[PDB]
Amino acid sequence: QVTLKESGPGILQPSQTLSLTCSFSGFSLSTYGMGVGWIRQPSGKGLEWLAHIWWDDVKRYNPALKSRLTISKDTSGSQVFLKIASVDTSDTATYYCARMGSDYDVWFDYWGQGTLVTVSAASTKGPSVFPLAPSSGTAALGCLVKDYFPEPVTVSWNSGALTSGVHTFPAVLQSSGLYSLSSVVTVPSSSLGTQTYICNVNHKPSNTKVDKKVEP
């Protein structure tokens, strides 16, 4: 059915142009009444509408941001793009695209999960993945994902085949200015001699993809 997905740079220098893409399934912007909008959420602050575009190529912009925004779509209407010019640190936020559920009302029936953009002069650092080894019915194990920049990191267990009992914790900003997180799963102790547990770590700004086997 209906899906949207945002893509962007993950990180960029102040005063550069932010270029964002929204790809979608289950609908087309060449269908009468369709729309896609861009919304953002700076860390800890509220959501903010930025722009939207309709099937007939009519656009609206946040007037406080208008001079900097450019929204567009392609001819077939299977993608929507956004450019924010001359970025500063107040453009650091999670960016969402969302479909408008009506031909004229500006409400968003489906959302992408958002992509994080960090405006920083700092350079990208890839994480190191360290085993959290089970010590001894039920045992805890996991992965420590240490010293990366910027956010985010994604962690899955056994390529997504293990989801029950998983806690992937909010990342913490260490005094070094690099983030560190833990992902943790509880499993039965008997499955330790039978089952292998692998944590899958992605860090897209460093192009880092690690699979880390975790053994007793």
């Binding site: 903010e48 959302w111 085993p131 959290l132």
Partner: protein
Amino acid sequence: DVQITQSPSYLAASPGETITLNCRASKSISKYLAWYQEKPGKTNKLLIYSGSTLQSGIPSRFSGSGSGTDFTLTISSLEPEDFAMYFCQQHNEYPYTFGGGTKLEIKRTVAAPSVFIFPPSDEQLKSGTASVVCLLNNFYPREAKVQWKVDNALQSGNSQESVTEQDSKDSTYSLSSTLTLSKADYEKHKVYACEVTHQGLSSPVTKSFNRGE
């Protein structure tokens, strides 16, 4: 433009019960206010548009009401799954504005954490740092304290905590504490302990290990 405020910003409520959230507009927005649900790892979900029309697929125990300047969302058979941030948006007047949100906590029975301590891996030691991790798994309520002791010395200023959002199935929290030492100080000390005080415990629980075991 139109300022949207949500009150209260935070709410706690039991499964089975009915609560009502409030969304207020600074000017009149006629009837054009939508309500969304936000859960971790999940895409945002529209519940109500135009003040009170119930979006397809959304269970009838969600309803909305109100017009002009003030609006409400009422959720009737509260489930542990209803934990979320609930925010509203006016879709009447450009520029389109969002409320700050109301965080809904689900109440449940007290439950003590299972506690696990983790030594630094050997791989990590090779680079002059030692991370020691203490896990507090599946507890309720949120309030808990984690003390780090190295050879029975209270640590200060060298640990960091992180907590998960309420679990959608069982309503519990999980917490992670990381002690950071350099290799030098780590291989100087023997006993590493994490001490946990929680309401679901009759007295503080200490989990520990001995370096090089």
